[PDB]
Design a protein around this ligand. Sequence first.
Ligand code: 1NN
Ligand code: 1NN
Ligand code: 1NN
Ligand code: UDP
Ligand code: UDP
Lengths: 233, 233
Amino acid sequence: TRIKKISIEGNIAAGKSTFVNILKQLSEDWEVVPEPVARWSNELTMEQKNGGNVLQMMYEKPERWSFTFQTYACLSRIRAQLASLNGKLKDAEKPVLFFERSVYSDRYIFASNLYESESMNETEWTIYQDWHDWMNNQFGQSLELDGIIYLQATPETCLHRIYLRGRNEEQGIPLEYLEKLHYKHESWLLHRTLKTNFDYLQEVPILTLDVNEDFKDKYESLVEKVKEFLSTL
Amino acid sequence: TRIKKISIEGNIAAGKSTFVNILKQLSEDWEVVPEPVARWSNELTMEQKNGGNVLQMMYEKPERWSFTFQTYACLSRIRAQLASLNGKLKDAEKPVLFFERSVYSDRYIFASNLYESESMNETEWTIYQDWHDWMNNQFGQSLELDGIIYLQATPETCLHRIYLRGRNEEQGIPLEYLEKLHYKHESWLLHRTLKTNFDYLQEVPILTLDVNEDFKDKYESLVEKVKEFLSTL
Ligand SMILES: CCc1sc(-c2ccc(OC)c(OCCF)c2)nc1CSc1nc(N)cc(N)n1
Ligand SMILES: CCc1sc(-c2ccc(OC)c(OCCF)c2)nc1CSc1nc(N)cc(N)n1
Ligand SMILES: CCc1sc(-c2ccc(OC)c(OCCF)c2)nc1CSc1nc(N)cc(N)n1
Ligand SMILES: O=c1ccn([C@@H]2O[C@H](COP(=O)(O)OP(=O)(O)O)[C@@H](O)[C@H]2O)c(=O)[nH]1
Ligand SMILES: O=c1ccn([C@@H]2O[C@H](COP(=O)(O)OP(=O)(O)O)[C@@H](O)[C@H]2O)c(=O)[nH]1
C-alpha cells in the first residue's frame, strides 16, 4: 500500500529481535513482523500448538521433521506478513514494515542448510522448492522486498549471545553449525553470489551492519544507516 | 462463472478415469482435468519425477510419507486445475470443466482416512488442515464447485476392477481399505453426515450415479443423467 518492505536478515542470536524492537519504537511509520519461529520458540493459538510440537520434533529428529517444519514455518510467515500489510501502518506518510527474516531466508538459508546436512532428501527438497515457488506466486508479490538489512556478525559473536540469552536448548548449538549458517548468509548478502529463482532479488539493495559491538544501549549510528538507507529506496 | 466446475468423485477404480475419458469426447465445450496422482502411477517434469517418488515412498511407509504426499498431491491438483481454468474453454458456448476428484476428496477422504489409519499423527493432520483451510480460502470463488457427480461403485466392484486394471502395486491394495473409503464417500456425498470447513458444500448439488454395472459400451443413460444434472445448474 505504498509501504516500504524491509527484511532484517542475519544468523541466530545476532540481535534481529533486539534491533527490530528498537526500530518500531522510534516511529509510528515503522511496524514489525516478528518471525513465526521465534513466537513458536517457547487459551493458546492453534498455530503455536502446531509450531510448539513440530519445533521440538525437529530438535529430536531433524531427519524426520525438516520438510514439515520448513513448509509450516514459511506458511506461517506468508500469512503473518500479508496480515501486517492489511492492517499495520494504517495509516502513515512514510510507512515501513520490518520483516523479521523473510520467505527467502526460509529457503536459501535453513531449508537449504537442512538438505545439505541431509535432514531432507532430494524429493523433499525439490518438493519444498516446488512448494515454495508456487506458494509465493499465488499469495506472493505484495511482499516483494524493497531492501534487506543484514545484521552481520562473526559466528563466534552469536554463540556468545546464545549463551547470553539464557536458553538451555541452544547452549548445545555447535560453532560449525553457526558457521554453516553464517557462510550461507555471506554468499547471499555479502558477496551476492547466491543466485535465487527470484529475478528482482539480485537487484534488491542490501545494507550491512556490524552487530559485534553490543548496540542495545548504543544504537544511533546503526539507526542512521537505516534512515539514510530508507531515503535511498 | 462462467466455466462451470464439476468434480467426479469415486472409490479407487470406481470408473472415474473411464467416465471422464468418455465424457471429454462428447462436447467440444467439455474438458477434463485428471488428478496428479492418477497420472504419477505409471526426462519427466519436476512434479512427474517427485510424484513418482513420493507415491513409491508412501507405498513403502505411509506413516512417514503421508503428510508429504498429501501436501504435494493437493498442491499439484490445484495447479493442474488452475491451468485449465486459466487457459482452456477460453470462450466457448457453454463451458463445463470436469475435475477428476477435488481438494475436498484430497482432504476429507484421503488425508482424513490416513490420520484415522494412524499414518498421520495429530500435529501433521492439524498442520495439513490449517494450510488447506487458509490456502483454498485465498482464491475463494475460483476452484469452488458448481456440482459433484458421485460414482457409487462397491468395494468388491472397485476390487473386481482394480483387478481388470491389473496394475502391480495395486494388487497390493486390500479389500478392507476400500471399505472405509466407501464409508467416507457415502457419509460425505450420499448420507451427508460429514462436516467440512467450506460452508457451501452443504448447498452444492450432487448427482449420484450407481455405477456398479459395466458401462464402456453402455454409457448413454449415464451421460443422459449428466446433461439433465447440469441443466439444473
Ligand atoms: C530454530 C529451530 C531449529 S532446530 C534445528 C535443528 C535442530 C537439531 C538439529 O540436529 C540435532 C539440526 O540439524 C541441523 C543440521 F543441518 C537442526 N534447526 C532449527 C532452525 S531451521 C529454521 N527454519 C526456518 N524456516 C526459520 C527458522 N527460524 N529456523
Ligand atoms: C537456533 C535454534 C536451534 S538450532 C539448534 C541446533 C541446530 C543444529 C544442531 O546440530 C547440528 C544442534 O545440535 C544440538 C541439538 F542437539 C542444535 N538448536 C537450537 C535451539 S532449539 C530450541 N527449542 C526451543 N523449544 C526453544 C529454543 N529457544 N530453542
Ligand atoms: C496411489 C495412492 C495411494 S498409495 C496408498 C497406500 C499404500 C500402501 C499402504 O500401506 C501398505 C497404505 O496404507 C495402509 C495402512 F495405512 C496406503 N494409499 C493411496 C491413496 S492416497 C491419495 N490421496 C489423494 N489426495 C488422492 C489420491 N488419489 N490418493
Ligand atoms: O546488541 C545486542 C544484541 C543482542 N543482545 C543479546 O543477545 C541475544 C540475541 O538477540 P536476539 O534475540 O535479538 O537475536 P535474534 O535471534 O533475534 O537474532 C539476546 O539475549 C539479546 O539481549 C544484546 O544484549 N545486545
Ligand atoms: O464399466 C467399466 C468401468 C471400468 N472398467 C475398468 O476398470 C479399470 C479401472 O477403472 P477406472 O480407472 O475407471 O477407475 P478410477 O480409479 O479411474 O475411478 C479400468 O482398466 C477400466 O477399463 C471396466 O472394465 N468396466
